[PDB]
Design a protein around this ligand. Structure first.
Ligand SMILES: *[C@@H]1O[C@H](CO[C@@H]2O[C@@H](C)[C@@H](O)[C@@H](O)[C@@H]2O)[C@@H](O[C@@H]2O[C@H](CO)[C@@H](O[C@@H]3O[C@H](CO[C@H]4O[C@H](CO)[C@@H](O)[C@H](O)[C@@H]4O[C@@H]4O[C@H](CO)[C@@H](O[C@@H]5O[C@H](CO)[C@H](O)[C@H](O)[C@H]5O)[C@H](O)[C@H]4NC(C)=O)[C@@H](O)[C@H](O[C@H]4O[C@H](CO)[C@@H](O)[C@H](O)[C@@H]4O[C@@H]4O[C@H](CO)[C@@H](O)[C@H](O)[C@H]4NC(C)=O)[C@@H]3O)[C@H](O)[C@H]2NC(C)=O)[C@H](O)[C@H]1NC(C)=O
Ligand SMILES: *[C@@H]1O[C@H](CO[C@@H]2O[C@@H](C)[C@@H](O)[C@@H](O)[C@@H]2O)[C@@H](O[C@@H]2O[C@H](CO)[C@@H](O[C@@H]3O[C@H](CO[C@H]4O[C@H](CO)[C@@H](O)[C@H](O)[C@@H]4O[C@@H]4O[C@H](CO)[C@@H](O[C@@H]5O[C@H](CO)[C@H](O)[C@H](O)[C@H]5O)[C@H](O)[C@H]4NC(C)=O)[C@@H](O)[C@H](O)[C@@H]3O)[C@H](O)[C@H]2NC(C)=O)[C@H](O)[C@H]1NC(C)=O
Lengths: 210, 210
């Protein structure tokens, strides 16, 4: 069995924040010792680009090399729906394998973000639940984070988006905080990043109301 | 080659609610046109039963037959972890197919159920979201439903359950109601059904203060 190619997209968050650097990653596995050479061609909307970076081959414990090329994408190219093509050629192949990736299609919809304090009934436990409901968004690529006092929160979990009856996605994120911190008046913030937000980011805060 | 067999568990609401009737379902597809006869053996912890009823086979568009055998299960057997085995016999099967199924394993933990009123921010919109958080449950089989003044309110979606940071599951269900109904004081309740609850059932309610 000849070599195989897997093509990976930027992290949504990397495409949304200008300070980060999104990458499309082209991975070849099952390369042979007899046919070690692997070259990469990269196309954006069909037009060859030359600026990628290809690491040196590496041998897997199974006696094949794995070779990785990384293309840096511009934020707005990705967001503008450009198609990234990895073409991987190698003498153990009848013809060079081409792969193509790009952002999910569909009209963007701006998320609404709402935060909700813990239920009265929970105010009895050792830890409590702060909720961030994000709804009405499209496409489903999104990042949701929590923080407090200039530091991230650890213990949150955020369910996968699902498709809401009206054609858009929603999700929640649950932050658990020991009741003391909550009772002591610490402010907690849910940050949302999504291409259809202004600045690709919004944040909503809440704290105990006495 | 030949037929393949898939074995499906009862709906959770059906195992939890004693008036309802839970079924295990044994499905066979790619049954041949020339050896279309299929024989089912059903076992519960090894003992054969003889109460299943076979649907009459059904032609699929793709030229193959699909055959269903449905076994009615006792609520308490399923809940006590009895294993259900379906054995399928076809001419094209050098050997009968065996599949086994039983309820998800794990020490049951009782869910805590909380209900969140709409965010003050949302009150400005025409529709508002009511939120039901159910957390700390084990296993993940559960059924969550909304009602008001006794009637099903089905304009809601529920995230699938996902592990929380203690090995238990959590889930959130969102009910969307016209803002008019909310401020008018109608009461809304989240019904939750789970093997680790008392009588397998509880209901929490919310409404806007007169
Ligand atoms: C010819 O056609 C037939 C029929 O196809 C139909 O018509 C054709 C012509 C096409 O148009 C096609 O599009 C149409 O669908 C083909 O049959 C299909 O074959 C494939 C396999 O090749 C089947 O694939 C498996 O599907 C499982 C899930 O199926 C359910 O959900 C799908 C939709 O998501 C439905 O289509 C099915 O009907 C099943 O739906 C469920 O039905 C249950 C019984 O009715 C319901 O439960 C009962 O419901 C009643 C009331 O309804 C009561 O509630 C009862 O109490 C209750 O019991 C249930 O609600 C319902 N669920 C849903 C969601 O709707 C997959 O689970 C399965 O995946 C596993 O196995 C795969 C192996 O192929 C593997 O790749 C996966 O990784 C996964 O592996 C498993 O993992 C589990 C862990 O959970 C392990 O425990 C397992 O061991 C492991 N399996 C392994 C490794 O063995 C398959 O993907 C497909 O379902 C089937 N379609 C049918 C029957 O409609 C046929 O293939 C065609 N032939 C040819 C040559 O083309
Ligand atoms: C020979 O062995 C090779 C390599 O296997 C390794 O070594 C062997 C000896 C064993 O020790 C293995 O334990 C070890 O993995 C093996 O190759 C593998 O081949 C199979 C198919 O045959 C590949 O399976 C595919 O996997 C696809 C998804 O893979 C992702 O997730 C898996 C974990 O589930 C990882 O193992 C993969 O590395 C890969 O991880 C993803 O990597 C991409 C690109 O680096 C990440 O995207 C980038 O992330 C960075 C941040 O770091 C930036 O954000 C970039 O912007 C972004 O692009 C991505 O985040 C990450 N994801 C995760 C979850 O970590 C799957 O879709 C396919 O369907 C398929 O199942 C397998 O992955 C591959 N292993 C590799 C490439 O490492 C050969 O098959 C063996 N040959 C034989 C003959 O046995």
């Amino acid at each position: 069995g000849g070599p195989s190619v897997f093509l990976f997209p930027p992290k949504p968050k990397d495409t949304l924040m200008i300070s980060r650097t999104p990458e499309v990653t082209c991975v070849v596995v099952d390369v042979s010792h007899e046919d070690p050479e692997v070259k990469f061609n990269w196309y954006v909307d069909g037009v060859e680009v030359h600026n990628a970076k290809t690491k040196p081959r590496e041998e897997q414990y199974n006696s094949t090399y794995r070779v990785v090329s990384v293309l840096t994408v511009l934020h707005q190219d990705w967001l503008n729906g450009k198609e990234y093509k990895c073409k991987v050629s190698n003498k153990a192949l009848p013809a060079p394998i081409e792969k193509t990736i790009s952002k999910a299609k569909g009209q963007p919809r701006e998320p609404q973000v709402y935060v909700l304090p813990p239920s009265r009934d929970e105010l009895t436990k050792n830890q409590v639940s702060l909720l961030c409901l994000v709804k009405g968004f499209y496409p489903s690529d999104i990042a949701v984070e929590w923080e407090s006092n200039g530091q991230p929160e650890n213990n949150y979990l955020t369910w996968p988006p699902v498709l809401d009856s009206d054609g858009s996605f929603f999700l929640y994120s649950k932050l658990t905080v020991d009741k003391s911190r909550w009772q002591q008046g610490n402010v907690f913030s849910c940050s949302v990043m999504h291409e259809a937000l202004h600045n690709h980011y919004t944040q909503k805060s809440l704290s105990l109301s006495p």
